[PDB]
Subunit: 135 residues, 4 copies
Amino acid sequence: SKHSYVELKDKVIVPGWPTLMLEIDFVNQALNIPFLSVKEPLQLPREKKLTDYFTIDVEPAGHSLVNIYFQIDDFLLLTLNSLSVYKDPIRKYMFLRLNKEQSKHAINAAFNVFSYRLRNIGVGPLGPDIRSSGP
Amino acid sequence: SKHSYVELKDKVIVPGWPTLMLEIDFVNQALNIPFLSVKEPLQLPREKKLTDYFTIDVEPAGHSLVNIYFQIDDFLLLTLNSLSVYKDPIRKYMFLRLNKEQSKHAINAAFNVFSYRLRNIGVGPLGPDIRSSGP
Amino acid sequence: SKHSYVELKDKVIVPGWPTLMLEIDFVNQALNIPFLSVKEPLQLPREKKLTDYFTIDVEPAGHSLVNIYFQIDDFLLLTLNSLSVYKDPIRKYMFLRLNKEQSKHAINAAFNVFSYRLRNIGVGPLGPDIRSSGP
Amino acid sequence: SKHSYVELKDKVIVPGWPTLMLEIDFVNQALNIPFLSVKEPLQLPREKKLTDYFTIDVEPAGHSLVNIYFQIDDFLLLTLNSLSVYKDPIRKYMFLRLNKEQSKHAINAAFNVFSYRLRNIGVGPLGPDIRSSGP
Ligand SMILES: Nc1ccn([C@@H]2O[C@H](COP(=O)(O)O)[C@@H](O)[C@H]2O)c(=O)n1
Ligand SMILES: Nc1ccn([C@@H]2O[C@H](COP(=O)(O)O)[C@@H](O)[C@H]2O)c(=O)n1
Ligand SMILES: Nc1ccn([C@@H]2O[C@H](COP(=O)(O)O)[C@@H](O)[C@H]2O)c(=O)n1
Ligand SMILES: Nc1ccn([C@@H]2O[C@H](COP(=O)(O)O)[C@@H](O)[C@H]2O)c(=O)n1
């Protein structure tokens, strides 16, 4: 059956919360993207690798604008939704847009992806106040 | 007779398809641009070079915004339209806009072009699904 | 009590006036931001350091867009408002937006901040005329 | 008397014409900007330098957005208007906006300007056709 690749909008990143970063290596060309804001650091089951539940696709959408496509298996998308700060946003088929700044890196690397991992990034000293004190 | 240089809009790049890249060398300054999405890799006839049917022009259009102009001969523009994913878009007289990120490279190189080639770039692992599964 | 982190909009920078720069060091990754336009260079009291009245927080707000959060104590926010060119803009709880160009630097450094100082930057030769001759 | 610094809009650059470039050196940090499209290369009178009729001012207008201010004397602004492609655009008091890409360079150099010159840049091979064939 047909399935929409749903956009992982910027709202899945909420300031003042810990976030997990999507690190991508290309050929020497890097890419670091705030993937999702979480309320607990992700742990892939003991000896299992990220490659099992998660596969990415870096593809051009214009003359200098690139997208990243995601294939997220049940076990990860259930873990990710439970760790997420914003209401369960992660779908099985997803994509996020790279801005013209980042897109250049992916194009200069001919969209070829060598390796990719998710890493837990901590929060700042004012973090506690940032989240609790909203407009 | 007068002739409009038609804009090669970003829609001629459709994600999940193989694409050919316009590689430009300047002086040491590079430029890599997704030129057109194709459904078969381009082959210039055996021993003939790209210089014969295709000549480019890098020109400024503002204070930090540059354009690239194209002169495409019959043989190439017929081949390109047949390989294209989107409905026959390529005209004899064309131009595409570089964003402020890329424009800087062309300006820093004083618009001088040393060499330029078209290269066939493959598709990702999720590629098959990307094209077939549209919004 | 609840408190809004008020945005330090770009209007607090008025051309033709001396400005103080927020210099941030990350890990080797730098950041230089025009913080506030002043009409007298700031001096932290003799032997006291900036760390006492001023603490920053670098946090992501999207997939490639970062914010900087400020905790400004009474003594500094009173000094800063008095030195400011624009009407007393500085609040106790503040934030300013980094553009996609700068945000990339903060993300590539994993939001980690090593050191940060405020520095007084002089005005140009036409400066006197710039401020006095407004549209 | 009061005088408006008039904006040198991007329209003073018309594609397919030779252009003169404003080259600025800072501290090691560079800046290359298409200044004005001309129909004849500029020549400063024999042994006279550009410093005599032309003085620039690099000033911040926001948190990551910079402007460049111009003081153009009679002799140069008369020469420049006569060489210009677009209708006499150059005024005595002028400014042009740097985009977020370029602004970063000026800020990282603390707005300090070491040297600046105007250089005549040639036109491409399709140049003749570009200008004559307009939309
Ligand atoms: N995501 C990023 C961020 C920065 N960069 C920078 O672009 C440069 C490209 O590599 P070269 O300098 O070897 O050409 C890297 O050295 C790196 O500093 C990158 O390649 N990918
Ligand atoms: N299209 C691109 C993309 C990146 N770059 C980067 O800009 C740098 C400019 O050269 P220098 O470092 O020698 O000044 C290159 O090393 C390269 O990494 C470029 O010149 N053109
Ligand atoms: N705010 C800024 C401005 C420029 N840069 C540049 O990005 C580069 C990143 O470091 P590497 O070249 O060592 O990867 C620095 O060398 C620096 O020239 C930066 O890291 N932060
Ligand atoms: N206008 C420009 C364009 C590029 N750059 C690049 O930014 C770099 C900044 O210098 P460092 O690498 O020495 O930090 C330069 O090497 C240069 O390649 C610049 O400084 N000004």
